[PDB]
Design a protein around this ligand. Sequence first.
Ligand SMILES: COC(=O)C[C@@](O)(CCC(C)(C)O)C(=O)O[C@@H]1C(OC)=C[C@]23CCCN2CCc2cc4c(cc2[C@H]13)OCO4
Ligand SMILES: [Mg+2]
Ligand SMILES: [Mg+2]
Ligand SMILES: [Mg+2]
Ligand SMILES: [Mg+2]
Ligand SMILES: [Mg+2]
Ligand SMILES: [Mg+2]
Ligand SMILES: [Mg+2]
Ligand SMILES: [Mg+2]
Ligand SMILES: [Mg+2]
Ligand SMILES: [Mg+2]
Ligand SMILES: [Mg+2]
Ligand SMILES: [Mg+2]
Ligand SMILES: [Mg+2]
Ligand SMILES: [Mg+2]
Ligand SMILES: [Mg+2]
Ligand SMILES: [Mg+2]
Ligand SMILES: [Mg+2]
Ligand SMILES: [Mg+2]
Ligand SMILES: [Mg+2]
Ligand SMILES: [Mg+2]
Ligand SMILES: [Mg+2]
Ligand SMILES: [Mg+2]
Ligand SMILES: [Mg+2]
Ligand SMILES: [Mg+2]
Ligand SMILES: [Mg+2]
Ligand SMILES: [Mg+2]
Ligand SMILES: [Mg+2]
Ligand SMILES: [Mg+2]
Ligand SMILES: [Mg+2]
Ligand SMILES: [Mg+2]
Ligand SMILES: [Mg+2]
Ligand SMILES: [Mg+2]
Ligand SMILES: [Mg+2]
Ligand SMILES: [Mg+2]
Ligand SMILES: [Mg+2]
Ligand SMILES: [Mg+2]
Ligand SMILES: [Mg+2]
Ligand SMILES: [Mg+2]
Ligand SMILES: [Mg+2]
Ligand SMILES: [Mg+2]
Ligand SMILES: [Mg+2]
Ligand SMILES: [Mg+2]
Ligand SMILES: [Zn+2]
Lengths: 50, 49, 103
Amino acid sequence: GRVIRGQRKGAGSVFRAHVKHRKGAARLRAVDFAERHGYIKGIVKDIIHD
Amino acid sequence: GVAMNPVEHPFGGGNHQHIGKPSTIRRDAPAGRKVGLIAARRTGRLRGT
Amino acid sequence: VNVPKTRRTFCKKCGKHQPHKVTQYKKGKDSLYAQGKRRYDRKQSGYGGQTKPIFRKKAKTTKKIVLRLECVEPNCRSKRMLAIKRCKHFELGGDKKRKGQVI
RNA sequence: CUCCGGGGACAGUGCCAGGUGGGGAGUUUGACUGGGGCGGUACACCUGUCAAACGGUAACGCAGGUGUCCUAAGGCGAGCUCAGGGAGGACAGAAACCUCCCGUGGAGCAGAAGGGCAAAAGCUCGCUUGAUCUUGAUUUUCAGUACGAAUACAGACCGUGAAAGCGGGGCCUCACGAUCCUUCUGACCUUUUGGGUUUUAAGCAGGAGGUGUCAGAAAAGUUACCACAGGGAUAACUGGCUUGUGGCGGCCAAGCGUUCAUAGCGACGUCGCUUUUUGAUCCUUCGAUGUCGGCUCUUCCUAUCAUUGUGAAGCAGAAUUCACC
RNA sequence: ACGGGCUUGGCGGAAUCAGCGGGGAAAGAAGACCCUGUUGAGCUUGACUCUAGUCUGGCACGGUGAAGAGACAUGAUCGUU
RNA sequence: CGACUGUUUAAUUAAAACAAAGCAUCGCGAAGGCCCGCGGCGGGUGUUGACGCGAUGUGAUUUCUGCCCAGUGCUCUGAAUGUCAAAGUGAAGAAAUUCAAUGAAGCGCGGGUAAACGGCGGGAGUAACUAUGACUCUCUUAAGGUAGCCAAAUGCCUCGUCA
RNA sequence: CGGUCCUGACGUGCGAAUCGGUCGUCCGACCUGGGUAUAGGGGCGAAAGACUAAUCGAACCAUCUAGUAGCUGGUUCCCUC
RNA sequence: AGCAUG
RNA sequence: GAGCAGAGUGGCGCAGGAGCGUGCUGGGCCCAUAACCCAGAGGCGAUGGAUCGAAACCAUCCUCUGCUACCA
Ligand SMILES: COC(=O)C[C@@](O)(CCC(C)(C)O)C(=O)O[C@@H]1C(OC)=C[C@]23CCCN2CCc2cc4c(cc2[C@H]13)OCO4
Ligand SMILES: [Mg+2]
Ligand SMILES: [Mg+2]
Ligand SMILES: [Mg+2]
Ligand SMILES: [Mg+2]
Ligand SMILES: [Mg+2]
Ligand SMILES: [Mg+2]
Ligand SMILES: [Mg+2]
Ligand SMILES: [Mg+2]
Ligand SMILES: [Mg+2]
Ligand SMILES: [Mg+2]
Ligand SMILES: [Mg+2]
Ligand SMILES: [Mg+2]
Ligand SMILES: [Mg+2]
Ligand SMILES: [Mg+2]
Ligand SMILES: [Mg+2]
Ligand SMILES: [Mg+2]
Ligand SMILES: [Mg+2]
Ligand SMILES: [Mg+2]
Ligand SMILES: [Mg+2]
Ligand SMILES: [Mg+2]
Ligand SMILES: [Mg+2]
Ligand SMILES: [Mg+2]
Ligand SMILES: [Mg+2]
Ligand SMILES: [Mg+2]
Ligand SMILES: [Mg+2]
Ligand SMILES: [Mg+2]
Ligand SMILES: [Mg+2]
Ligand SMILES: [Mg+2]
Ligand SMILES: [Mg+2]
Ligand SMILES: [Mg+2]
Ligand SMILES: [Mg+2]
Ligand SMILES: [Mg+2]
Ligand SMILES: [Mg+2]
Ligand SMILES: [Mg+2]
Ligand SMILES: [Mg+2]
Ligand SMILES: [Mg+2]
Ligand SMILES: [Mg+2]
Ligand SMILES: [Mg+2]
Ligand SMILES: [Mg+2]
Ligand SMILES: [Mg+2]
Ligand SMILES: [Mg+2]
Ligand SMILES: [Mg+2]
Ligand SMILES: [Zn+2]
């Protein structure tokens, strides 16, 4: 037979995600001394839709 | 899959659109065969929790 | 058929007729170091699948019965193989069939 | 003295081993055949016939059988005679057992059929294992190859009978299987390799495990998406032979026809014609003869519906039937 | 086994024009239907033989200690596993 | 017949076929699920995290989704007799070798599951005119076709019977 | 942008798929240029076994290869027995 | 525990 | 047409040394009928053959039931 489409999806030729207009990867703050022991404050500036 | 051809899918083919074999495939099935309900513990409409 | 357990017949080592012990012959266990066995084993080892034919189409439902005759003489102990015609049922030392009896 | 945390001798990797594995690979998917397929086995064997009075001789010809069974249903010897029928005897009878008479087989001999058999080849007793070891020759199918089966001897060792003899399977015609591989049996057997001892292994001879497609490859389908080499050796359409079948027509005359076989019909039988029905065949056509209907258009046939000319009616007229050119 | 040619007859007269669709079993394409071949390919599965992958066991990488059940060097310490 | 819009065999088929929203299952909490790769601390989903990704069936709305776990699949627990490779352990033997015990997954054994693949009977008597026959007897299955619908694009008989 | 019907024209054509009238859609799952990614047992597919340079139920190019064919076709002067 | 009918 | 299944008490069925539930009949309990209880009677499709013996085995038939009768 022939390779099925669910099986073709692994190579990611035309099945890769469309990521040009994404605004970035949403991640928490990195671990450091300040947040490990005390705390720091940050200002919220924008709320975006990606 | 049933709308496809047998060369294209393990379900395609026949004079009627029917799967022709149990839809529950085992977990250890090779890629290209592992379609349908993947290692289903149960099937059908849920009745309760 | 029915065959008695004792028979008087020719003995090759003694050179004359002697009583014998009659038992049915049974095939021995296949050796692992026969020439054919180890040639076949080496041929099968590796890749390539089955290398010799395998018989599939049985036709016969009977096998020829072979008797093992042992000379009862203490210091001879000679043995022979005596083949009889193929039969479905075979027994050694069955009760003799008698006529003029009520069934 | 490991950058911080989190796991940790476990994930994991490398090599073997066991499962699973049409995801994928390779391949196979018998023959004969009144086309092929379904069916069947006429594929290996035996009996009667076909078969045309030596032998041989075909079809998916006719009627049947086989892949077994037997410690005796094998081998001797002895003694008896069977199927059936008749006449008698308490229960007892249509049929139980006893007695006499007739009884050429009309019974039986394991099985299908044919042949053969009466102080036996059958039935009953007694003893037994020639259904054992061995080299050759011949017959049957036949290529005068093999297997299978059989025949006549010869050499041992035996059984049986007083003995002559008989007997190395079944009264005869059937009842079965090569190479390679495995297994058992035999020898004060041969080799196991530079010598020797010992296990092992390989040789020689005889049995067994099997190929039924039976002179013996290891083998499931589908293709209406299909391909190639070919076949008129072989189907579907047309043409040809035939005419069961379909259609049409005769001869005979029991009866119908209120009387009256034949105005008109006409049973039981029997004789033909046509190829506008369907069958059977496979001669032409597979390097292609464009398949069913309808439309259009020409011609031909008569087995005459109407029309012209007639003959007969159970033809008064009208109408309707039968027949003729 | 439906001849243009052969046999027996009917018969036959140069060279041409416009149409026509009866026939040349007209042309095209070594029939695509059917059968044969010990020729194939696409596809399938309860065909035969394998196989990627996957599940599991052993060995090596592969160490440091403490307790439990043990074989051990008739109760017990000590050390081999 | 298909909800609609849309799509399709470029060159014989534009369709009732495909898709579609809606509906319903299945797997997976990242050392993961599905998949690619000859190969590596390789790669896609994934600049992702269950209101997600991946695998399927059906096919808008309304009204419903009947019974069957016997068959084949799928899946859940390993201690009763089971079976079961390699390695390792013990014993006999001059050794090759042989024997014995132990013994993983899988298969058996035991549950669950049909919006998994699929399946869903026959024969007789019987009401006070005939006729039907609610009713009864029986054999039988895993269950014996429920609600609906029909000579239908599904019915041989068949140009079924009535209008 | 597409391609229903006339099964019209043409069918050694204008054209190895064109022409006419009639047709479907025409704010969206819309039409389109250039750039870019996916390669042959592979891609890609709103799925027709469709498309992948006039080639697709496995493209094209060279080679193994003068592959095999129990099957079609052909096979070259004379006379004499 | 089973208990229909006129 | 070929293969194949099945004929058994009144009706539906089991099956080498004639029966089941139901039906039917007699008697019980009841005012009476059914239900309930106690008893009883009722017969291998046909033919031929293998067999000491068959309803069961083997052939031919008489019915009936189902499955195929494709490809052009
Ligand atoms: C271009 O189309 C063609 O070529 C036609 C064709 O395909 C069509 C028929 C078929 C598809 C079945 O083959 C074909 O094969 O015809 C064959 C032919 O060639 C013309 C000659 C034959 C033989 C002698 C007369 N007859 C003429 C028609 C014919 C009709 C048939 C038939 C066989 C034939 C053959 O069987 C059922 O009816
Ligand atoms: Mg399709
Ligand atoms: Mg497949
Ligand atoms: Mg190996
Ligand atoms: Mg394959
Ligand atoms: Mg092939
Ligand atoms: Mg053939
Ligand atoms: Mg003669
Ligand atoms: Mg005598
Ligand atoms: Mg002699
Ligand atoms: Mg005799
Ligand atoms: Mg050989
Ligand atoms: Mg040596
Ligand atoms: Mg030495
Ligand atoms: Mg088709
Ligand atoms: Mg011919
Ligand atoms: Mg014709
Ligand atoms: Mg006639
Ligand atoms: Mg009269
Ligand atoms: Mg002929
Ligand atoms: Mg032509
Ligand atoms: Mg013509
Ligand atoms: Mg006339
Ligand atoms: Mg013409
Ligand atoms: Mg040809
Ligand atoms: Mg061709
Ligand atoms: Mg041949
Ligand atoms: Mg298999
Ligand atoms: Mg639509
Ligand atoms: Mg098209
Ligand atoms: Mg579903
Ligand atoms: Mg349902
Ligand atoms: Mg189940
Ligand atoms: Mg109903
Ligand atoms: Mg079109
Ligand atoms: Mg046209
Ligand atoms: Mg023209
Ligand atoms: Mg790839
Ligand atoms: Mg598209
Ligand atoms: Mg198709
Ligand atoms: Mg290719
Ligand atoms: Mg060539
Ligand atoms: Mg040939
Ligand atoms: Zn001796």
